[PDB]
Design a protein around this ligand. Structure first.
Ligand SMILES: Nc1ncnc2c1ncn2[C@@H]1O[C@H](COP(=O)(O)OP(=O)(O)OP(=O)(O)O)[C@@H](O)[C@H]1O
Ligand SMILES: Nc1ncnc2c1ncn2[C@@H]1O[C@H](COP(=O)(O)OP(=O)(O)OP(=O)(O)O)[C@@H](O)[C@H]1O
Ligand SMILES: Nc1ncnc2c1ncn2[C@@H]1O[C@H](COP(=O)(O)OP(=O)(O)OP(=O)(O)O)[C@@H](O)[C@H]1O
Ligand SMILES: Nc1ncnc2c1ncn2[C@@H]1O[C@H](COP(=O)(O)OP(=O)(O)OP(=O)(O)O)[C@@H](O)[C@H]1O
Ligand SMILES: Nc1ncnc2c1ncn2[C@@H]1O[C@H](COP(=O)(O)OP(=O)(O)OP(=O)(O)O)[C@@H](O)[C@H]1O
Ligand SMILES: Nc1ncnc2c1ncn2[C@@H]1O[C@H](COP(=O)(O)OP(=O)(O)OP(=O)(O)O)[C@@H](O)[C@H]1O
Ligand code: MOO
Ligand code: MOO
Ligand code: MOO
Ligand code: MOO
Ligand SMILES: [Mg+2]
Ligand SMILES: [Mg+2]
Ligand SMILES: [Mg+2]
Ligand SMILES: [Mg+2]
Ligand SMILES: [Mo]
Ligand SMILES: [Mo]
Ligand SMILES: [Mo]
Ligand SMILES: [Mo]
Ligand SMILES: [Mo]
Ligand SMILES: [Mo]
Ligand SMILES: [Mo]
Ligand SMILES: [Mo]
Ligand SMILES: [Mo]
Ligand SMILES: [Mo]
Ligand SMILES: [Mo]
Ligand SMILES: [Mo]
Ligand SMILES: [Mo]
Ligand SMILES: [Mo]
Lengths: 245, 268, 245, 245, 268, 245
C-alpha cells in the first residue's frame, strides 16, 4: 500500500525564476491571472531562482566553493523571487511563508487564506549531493518532492517556453528543436542534452507515490496556467510512472 | 576553459546543459576544513547502550582532541525505529518519517554534549562553519546531530517509507562538503564481514574493500546505509571511509593515529 | 477577585502518549472521532510522550544526567506524537504549533482553523525542579497549567484506561483495582501508589483559578471523548477545588 | 510614479505607551472600544513604550551606553505593552505578532482574524542613528514608516492628550498652551519645543509616498478613536505633504 | 547637571523636550569595543570580482588579525542591483527593496566566511557583542553582513525607491555604535577623486577632505553612500573614515598599520 | 435616550440610478472601485431608479394612475439596476438581496460575504403618501431610512454630479449654479428649486437618530467614493441635525 495523501485538495504551482527575471512585463499579467485563480483553487506557489543564481554560481565557483556551499546561495534567490511575488499579491491576503512553515503548518495557513508563496528550492543546503559542481536538487525538484509528499492534486511548472523541445529552443541547435506535447520521465532521463526542468526532477519522479503527471506551460501566455490547473493540455505533459492504486 | 567561458555558459544555457556542467567541473576546488575528522557515533550501536559504551568514548574524544580536530555526529537508534514503525503503520510518507528521526538524533547529541560540556566541547549548528570552537586547542571539537536536513523534502527509497538518507549519510555529506581529511563511522562490530556477524557464525572479516567489490558480494546494505556507498563514489573530497568498533577501548584513538583498525571502504 | 479568562470558549484535550504508542489501531479511530468534533468545538489538542520517553530516561539515567536534562528529552517525544497526530488531521486544516505560538498566538490560530495540536509538556527544560530523578512537570501537568491559565472551558485527559482505579489495573495488584467514578485532587494527593496522571497535576490543581473538574476517559473506546466534551460522565472526574465566583 | 499600495484596505492604530501606563482605568474602556471596531476595520494595532523606557534610559545613560544600545531597550517596553493589549483582546481572536511577521506575513494574519497587535518601535536596534543620546526613531516614527510603506488607508495616533498644543499642556508653560486643530508636518518641524509625537515622525512624513494626514486623538475619551477611523475631526490633524496622484 | 536632574526630566517631559535632550547629551560615554576596526569589503568593487580580488584580501585579513581586532562587513553588489531593478519596475517601495538587498549581502558574508573558517573566523550575529570571537588571539575577527536591519521600516530617499541606507551605512553605524577606533571602506579605487575616475580621464586624487568640503565640490554621492557623510557628522565615536583600494595587495594591511593610503574623510 | 445601533459597523452606499443609466462607461470603473473597497468595509449597496422610472411615470400619469400605483413601478427600476450591479460583482461573492432579506437577515448575509446589493426604494408601495403625483419616498429617502434605522456608520450618496449646487448644473439656470461644499438639511429644506436628492430625504433627516452627515459625491470620478468612505471631503456634506449623545 502507498502512503496516504496529506493534502489531497492542494494544487502546487512552480514559477520559473527566469519568468520573474523578466520583471513587470511578465509578472503583472501573471499576478492578475493568479488573482483570478485564488477563488478556484487552494494554491501553494513556489518560486525558482533564475539568473541571479547563475551569477552567484560564477562567483562561488571562481572562489572554488563546493556544491554544498552553492546550494543555499542559489536557494536565496528563489526566496527573494518569492517575496517579490507575494508582495504583489498581499492585497488579496497572500504572503510568503518559510520552509519550516510549509513543512509543518501549511494546512492552517491554507485555512486562513487562499494561497501562500514559498521557495521552490529544497533545504538540502550543505548536505547537497556531490558529483556535479552545480547543485542538482533545484526548484523543479523541490516543488515536486513537496507536491508528491503532500499527495497534492497536481504540480504545474510555469516556464518561459511552451514546454519541452528536442533541443534548447533558445540555444545553438534551436533550428532542429521540435515541440514535445507529451513525454515520460524515463524517456527524458535516457535522453542527453538540456531540458527546461532539473534532471533530478526525473529521478524523484521515478520514486514518486502519487503525482502521475506534471505539465510544463508557458507563463508568458495568459490563460495557460488557468487551463493547466483544470487539466487542459496546453504545454508538455510529463508522465511520472506512478500509475493508479 | 576560462572564467569568461564558464560565465557565458552560466548565463546562456540551462543548468542541465552538458556543456555547462563540464565547464563547471573544471572549477578550482576549495576545502573548507581540510584538517578536521568527522566521526559518527552510532545511536543503536553505541549511545543506546548507555554508560558502558558512551563513557569510554567520551574519554577518548577528550584525549584525542589535543592532536585532532573532530566533528562528532550522533546517530539515532531504537527510538527512531519506534517512531518509524508508528508512522509507517499510519501510511505516513518518508518525508514525515525523516522529521521524526531527526528529533532522536538531536536527543543523542544533547546527551553526548552534556557529558563533554565541562571539557569545553559544545553541541553546535553549522559545525563545518563553527570555526571558532574548532580553532582552539582548549576545544578543537564539536558535537552535532547526524540527520540530514531534508525533512519533508527527503527523497524516498524505491520501496517503503523508511528515509534512505539517515545519520550515516548526514555525517558523510558533512565531511564531504567541508573537505575533511577523514571519515570514521563508530559502530558495535569490528568492521565489515562477509555477512551480518550478529546472525552468522562464520562470517569473515574484510579489512579493505571498494564500493564495487561490496556490491558484487551483496554487501550493499550491510554495516553502512547503502546510499552512503553511492555518495562515496560521487564524492570530491572524502574518497574512503573507515568503520571501527567503538565498544573496544582505544579503537577511535588508534584510528585517528593512522592505525588500520576496522574496515576501510574505498570509492574505487 | 480571580484573573480573567483569556480564552473562555477554548476546549483543551490531552492525548496520552501511550494511546499514540498503540499505532494505527488506536490512532485511526481517534482521528476519525476528532474530525467529527472539529465543527463542534474550538480545540487545543496536546500530546503526551509515552514509551519513548521511558527509553530516553533509561539511557539518560544510566549516563547519570540530572532531572533538568531528562525533562527536555522527554518533551521531545511528546512533540513527535504531536506532529504524527497533526499530520493525520492535515486535510481538515489542522497543524502542529510550537510552544511560543501556543503561548502568544493561540487566538489567531484558532481563528484560522478549528483545532491545533501542540506538545503537552511544559517548557520547564533545564529549570525543572529537583528532588525526583524523574521530571515531575509532565504532559498532564503542562496541559492543565495551560488550560487553567487560559481560563478554558475544560480539560479532558484521554487515556488508555477507563479512568483512575485504586491500583494500577495493568500492574501487580490489578486484582484489587476498583474503578473510581469521581474523586478530588486533595484526596488523590493524600493517597500513595501509582496513578494514570502526574502527581504534579494534583499540586497545580490546588492553586488553580478556573477549571473545576478534569475528566479522564478511555480514548480506546470511540465516543467517550465526544461525550466528555459535552460534560457526560464516562470516566473519572477529578474535582480541583476551584469553586465558583 | 509612486510605489503601489501593498495593503490599501489596512488601518494602522498606534497606542501611546503612556495610555497603557494608566492601567485598567484607561485600558478597559479602550479594549471595549477596540472590540466594537473589529468588525468595522482591518486593524494593525501598534503599541508605544511609555514610562518604563524612561527608566531604562536613566539606567542606560548612567551606565554610559550609546543610542544604539538604548534603542532596543526601549523597544522592549513597547513589545510588553503589545502583549498586554493583545491578551485583553485574545477572546476576540487577537494576538501579538512579531516584527518579522508584520513585515512579511501581515496579509495572511489579517485574513485569519480582524486585528493583530505589534510593537510600534522600528527595528533600528544597534543601527540607530547617532546624534541625540535619545533614540530618535521611536513608536510614532515606526508606526508611520509601516503605515506609509504598506500604503495603508490611514494612521491614527492615540494619545493621553487631545492633540498637539503650542506648549506641553502638562508642563511648566501649560498656561499658554493653545490647542492646534490642524497643522502641517513642515510647520511643526520648524517649531522648537516639545511635541506629543517624535520629531523623527515629521522627517519621515516629508518623504512619505501615500499617507496624506495623520490624526492625533485622546484615547482617554471613549469614541474618539472610533470617530477618527471614520475621518471625523476630533483631535489634531497633521498634514504630511503627500498630495494626490 | 546631576543624575537626579536627568531622571526628573526623563520622567516628567516628553523625549522631544529640548531640555531633556540637552541633559541626555551630558551623559557619560562608554565605548563597547574601543579597540576594534570595522572593515567593509565592497560587494561590487571586490567580492563580485571573484578569486583575483577576494583571495589576496583573505590572506591579508588572516595576517592582520594577529595584531588587530577586525569586524569585517560585506557589501552586496550586482545581484542586489538586479533585484532593485526588478522590484522598482513593479512599483515596490524602498522598504521591500531593503529586505531584498540584505539577502545579497548575506550571500557574500557566507562566501567570505567559508574561505576564513579554517582560520577560526566565523560569520556572526551581534558582531559588536560577539565578544568571544574577538577576544581570542587565535581568532580576533568576525565576518558580518553589512546591510542595516531596517527592512520594511527603511526610510526612503527623497526620490526613487532605492534604499538610501545600504552596506556603507550599515557598516559605519556598527563601528559608531560600538565605539570602534577605526572605519575602513575597502573598494576598487585608490580613494576619492575630483570626479568618478571610471568615467573621467583627468580626475585628481584627494588624500584628505572633510564632509563639508566634499559637499562644496559636488562629491556628496561619490565613492560612499551620501547618507554616510551625514551620519559621520552626527557621530559620537567614529569622526573620520578611510577609503582604500582592496585590489592593491597590502593596502588593507598598511591602512591598519597607520599608513595614509587612500583617502581620509573627516567629519569636520 | 436614543435607540441602540443595530449594525454600527455597517457602511451604506447609494448608487444613483442615473449613474447606472450611463452604462459600461460609468459602471465598469465603479465596479472596479467597489471591488477594491470590499476588503476595507462592510457594505450595503443600494441602487436608485434613473431614467426608466421617468418613462413609467409618463405612461402611468397619462393613464391617470395615483401616486401609490407609480411608487412600486419606479421601485422596479431600482431593483433592476441592483441586479445589474450585483451581477458585475458576482465573482467577488456579491449578490442582490430582497427587501425582506435586508430588513430581517442583513447581519447573516454580511457575515457570509463582504457586500450585498439591494433596491434603495423603500417599500411604501400602494401606501405612498398622497399630495404630489410623483412618489416622494424614493431612493435617497429609502437608503437614509435604512442606514439610520440600522445605526450604520455612514451613508454615502453616489451621484452623476459633484454634489449640491445653488441651481441645476445641467438645467436652464446652469450659469448661476454655485457649488455647495457643505450644507444643512434644514437650510436645504427651506430653499426652493431642484436638488440632486429627494426633498423627503431632508424630512427624514430631521427625525434621524444616529446619522449626523451624509456626503454626496461624483461616482463618475474614480476614487471619490473611496475617499468619502474614509470621511474625506470630496463632495457636498449634508448635516442632518442629529448631534451627539
Ligand atoms: N529541451 C528544451 N526544451 C525547452 N527549453 C529548454 C530545453 N533545453 C534548454 N531549455 C532552456 O531552458 C530555459 C528555462 O531555463 P531554466 O529552466 O533554467 O529557467 P527557470 O526554470 O525559470 O529557472 P529555475 O530553475 O531557477 O526556476 C528555456 O528558456 C530554454 O531556453
Ligand atoms: N556484513 C556486515 N558486517 C558487519 N556488520 C553488519 C553486516 N551486516 C549488517 N551488519 C549490522 O549493522 C550494524 C551497524 O549498523 P547500525 O545501523 O546498527 O549502526 P548505527 O550507526 O548505530 O545506526 P543508527 O545510528 O542509525 O542507530 C551492526 O550492529 C551489524 O549487526
Ligand atoms: N491507579 C491507577 N488507575 C489507572 N491507571 C493506572 C493507575 N496506576 C497506574 N496506572 C497505569 O497508568 C497507565 C497510563 O500510563 P501513563 O499515564 O504513563 O501513560 P500516558 O498518560 O499515555 O503517558 P504521558 O504521560 O506521556 O501522556 C495505565 O495504562 C495504567 O496501566
Ligand atoms: N506641544 C504638545 N502638545 C501636546 N502634548 C505635549 C506637547 N509637548 C509635550 N507634550 C506631552 O507629551 C505627552 C505624551 O507623552 P509621550 O508622547 O512621550 O507619550 P506616548 O506617546 O504615550 O509614549 P510612546 O512614544 O512611548 O508611545 C503628553 O501627555 C504631554 O504631556
Ligand atoms: N569621485 C569619485 N572618486 C572615486 N570613486 C568614485 C567617485 N565617484 C564615483 N565613484 C565610484 O564609486 C565606486 C565605489 O562605490 P561602490 O558602491 O561600487 O562600492 P561597493 O562598496 O562595492 O558597493 P556595494 O558594496 O554596495 O556593491 C567606485 O568603483 C567608483 O567607480
Ligand atoms: N441643485 C442641484 N445640484 C446638483 N444637481 C442638481 C440640482 N438640481 C437638479 N440637479 C440634477 O439632478 C441630477 C441627478 O438626477 P437624479 O437625482 O434624479 O438622479 P439619480 O439620483 O441618479 O436617480 P435616483 O433618484 O433614481 O437614484 C443631476 O444630474 C443634476 O442635473
Ligand atoms: O505558527 Mo503560525 O504563527 O500557523 O500561521
Ligand atoms: O505569527 Mo503567525 O505566522 O500567527 O499563525
Ligand atoms: O507563518 Mo504564519 O503565517 O500566521 O505561522
Ligand atoms: O434566510 Mo437566508 O436563506 O439568511 O441568506
Ligand atoms: Mg526551468
Ligand atoms: Mg497518563
Ligand atoms: Mg506620543
Ligand atoms: Mg439623485
Ligand atoms: Mo518566521
Ligand atoms: Mo518559521
Ligand atoms: Mo562559533
Ligand atoms: Mo559555538
Ligand atoms: Mo515556527
Ligand atoms: Mo515559533
Ligand atoms: Mo514567532
Ligand atoms: Mo517570527
Ligand atoms: Mo514563526
Ligand atoms: Mo556562538
Ligand atoms: Mo559568542
Ligand atoms: Mo561566535
Ligand atoms: Mo428570495
Ligand atoms: Mo426573501
Amino acid at each position: 500500500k502507498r502512503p496516504i495523501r496529506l493534502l489531497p485538495w492542494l494544487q502546487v504551482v512552480k514559477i520559473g525564476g527566469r519568468v520573474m527575471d523578466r520583471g513587470a512585463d511578465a509578472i503583472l499579467p501573471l499576478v492578475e491571472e493568479l488573482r483570478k485563480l485564488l477563488p478556484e483553487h487552494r494554491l501553494l506557489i513556489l518560486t525558482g531562482a533564475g539568473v541571479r543564481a547563475r551569477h552567484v554560481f560564477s562567483v562561488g565557483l571562481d572562489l572554488g566553493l563546493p556544491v554544498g556551499s552553492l546550494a543555499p546561495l542559489a536557494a536565496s534567490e528563489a526566496g527573494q523571487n518569492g517575496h517579490i511575488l507575494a508582495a504583489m499579491l498581499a492585497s488579496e491576503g497572500v504572503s510568503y511563508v518559510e520552509h519550516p512553515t510549509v513543512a509543518d503548518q501549511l494546512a492552517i495557513h491554507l485555512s486562513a487564506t487562499r494561497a501562500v508563496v514559498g521557495s521552490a528550492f529544497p533545504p538540502y543546503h550543505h548536505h547537497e549531493f556531490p558529483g556535479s559542481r552545480i547543485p542538482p536538487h533545484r526548484a523543479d525538484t523541490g516543488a515536486f518532492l513537496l507536491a508528491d509528499a503532500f499527495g497534492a492534486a497536481g504540480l504545474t511548472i510555469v516556464e518561459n517556453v511552451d514546454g519541452i523541445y528536442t533541443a534548447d529552443p533558445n540555444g545553438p541547435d534551436r533550428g532542429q528543436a521540435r515541440f514535445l506535447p507529451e513525454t515520460s520521465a524515463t524517456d527524458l532521463a535516457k535522453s542527453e542534452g538540456p531540458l527546461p526542468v532539473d534532471r533530478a526532477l526525473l529521478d524523484v519522479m521515478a520514486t514518486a507515490r502519487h503525482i502521475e503527471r506534471v505539465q510544463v506551460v508557458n507563463g508568458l501566455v495568459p490563460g495557460r496556467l488557468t487551463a493547466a490547473l483544470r487539466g487542459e493540455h496546453v504545454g508538455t505533459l510529463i508522465r511520472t510512472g506512478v500509475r493508479p492504486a | 576553459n576560462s572564467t569568461a567561458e564558464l560565465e557565458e555558459l552560466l548565463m546562456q544555457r540551462s543548468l542541465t546543459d552538458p556543456q555547462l556542467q563540464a565547464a563547471a567541473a573544471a572549477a578550482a576546488d576549495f576545502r573548507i576544513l581540510p584538517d578536521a575528522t568527522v566521526i559518527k557515533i552510532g545511536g543503536q550501536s553505541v549511545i543506546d547502550r548507555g554508560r558502558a559504551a558512551v563513557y569510554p568514548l567520551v574519554d577518548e574524544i577528550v584525549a584525542a582532541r589535543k592532536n585532532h580536530k573532530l566533528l562528532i555526529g550522533t546517530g539515532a537508534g531504537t527510538r527512531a525505529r519506534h517512531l518509524y514503525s508508528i508512522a509507517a503503520g499510519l501510511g505516513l510518507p518518508a518525508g514525515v518519517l525523516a522529521q521524526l528521526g531527526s528529533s532522536v538524533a538531536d536527543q543523542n547529541a544533547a546527551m553526548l554534549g552534556q557529558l563533554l560540556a565541562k571539557h569545553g566541547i559544545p553541541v553546535v549548528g553549522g559545525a563545518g562553519l563553527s570555526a571558532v570552537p574548532l580553532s582552539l586547542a582548549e576545544v578543537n571539537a564539536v558535537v552535532f546531530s547526524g540527520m540530514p536536513p531534508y525533512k519533508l523534502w527527503m527523497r524516498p527509497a524505491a520501496e517503503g517509507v523508511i528515509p534512505p538518507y539517515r545519520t550515516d549519510a548526514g555525517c558523510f555529506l558533512l565531511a564531504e562538503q567541508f573537505g575533511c581529511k577523514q571519515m570514521i563511522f563508530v559502530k558495535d562490530e569490528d568492521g565489515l564481514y562477509t555477512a551480518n556477524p550478529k546472525t552468522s557464525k562464520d562470517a569473515t572479516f574484510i579489512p579493505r574493500i571498494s564500493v564495487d567489490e561490496m556490491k558484487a558480494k551483496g554487501l550493499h546494505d550491510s554495516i553502512l546505509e547503502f546510499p552512503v556507498l553511492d555518495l562515496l563514489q560521487s564524492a570530491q573530497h572524502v574518497r574512503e571511509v573507515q568503520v571501527v568498533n567503538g565498544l573496544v577501548p582505544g579503537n577511535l584513538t588508534r584510528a585517528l593515529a593512522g592505525e588500520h583498525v576496522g574496515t576501510i571502504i574505498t570509492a574505487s
